[PDB]
Design a binder for these strands. Sequence first.
DNA 1: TCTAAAGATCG
DNA 2: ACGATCTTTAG
Length: 245
Amino acid sequence: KNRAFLKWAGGKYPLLDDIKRHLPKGECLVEPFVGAGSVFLNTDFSRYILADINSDLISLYNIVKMRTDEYVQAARELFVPETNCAEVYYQFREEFNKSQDPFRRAVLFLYLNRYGYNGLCRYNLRGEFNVPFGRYKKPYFPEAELYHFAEKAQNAFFYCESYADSMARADDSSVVYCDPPYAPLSSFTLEQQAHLAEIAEGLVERHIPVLISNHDTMLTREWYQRAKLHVVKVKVDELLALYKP
DNA sequence: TCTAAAGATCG
DNA sequence: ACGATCTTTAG
Ligand SMILES: Nc1ncnc2c1ncn2[C@@H]1O[C@H](CSCC[C@H](N)C(=O)O)[C@@H](O)[C@H]1O
């Protein structure tokens, strides 16, 4: 089980075996909500189409892919004991928000991810990262994970776009795995959750397999009515919806 | 999920 | 300018 180099909310590392058991085979895997890319890192497709609405995330992945050695060397310098301080953190956060250099932002993004509060990724409406200091004992610099990501990324294209556009990229030899933001138990809207299912239905009718993961609720069972539903026991369970052609 | 402070929105 | 109520911000 390969780990992502990023902390990311809604990561699927603990559920990978269940996903891989129901994920269909194909030439290309399409992930409209790639996030930290835990599925991408733990599958074996010949090609990947990876997308996310987060532009900082997609830019970071491109930098790591194309400028691997350069990035690792620069990012490693921020993972020293000197930087594990509140005053230093908030200046690096300010430098990130004020930088117009994709490389420097990518370097700082990793620092903020592993030194920031609970590994959160939060912005304001002005597009500024505003997660406070995390106060960890000793943040781990994911060098091994970075190089492995770069290696696997050689067979992947990255796109910053919404799910509707990325799922439109899927062709006959594609398999689509969707890991949308969790459905509410009591921003990704309810309409977007439903629209995702409608796009999935359209895809499978063109003989393109789609696998969606979400919480197991009354709403998600309704949204994914036209799919074979598998319950994953994990109090709420996890749901896997497979649209098989 | 928390919240005090600042800004948004409408009549 | 006012008042009530969200909305946003960010530790
Ligand atoms: N409208 C949208 N279109 C495409 N991606 C979106 C989106 N709204 C949210 N997202 C992205 O979907 C991701 C869901 S978290 C899923 C993470 C991933 N499965 C992993 O293993 O790491 C988030 O990173 C978020 O940035």
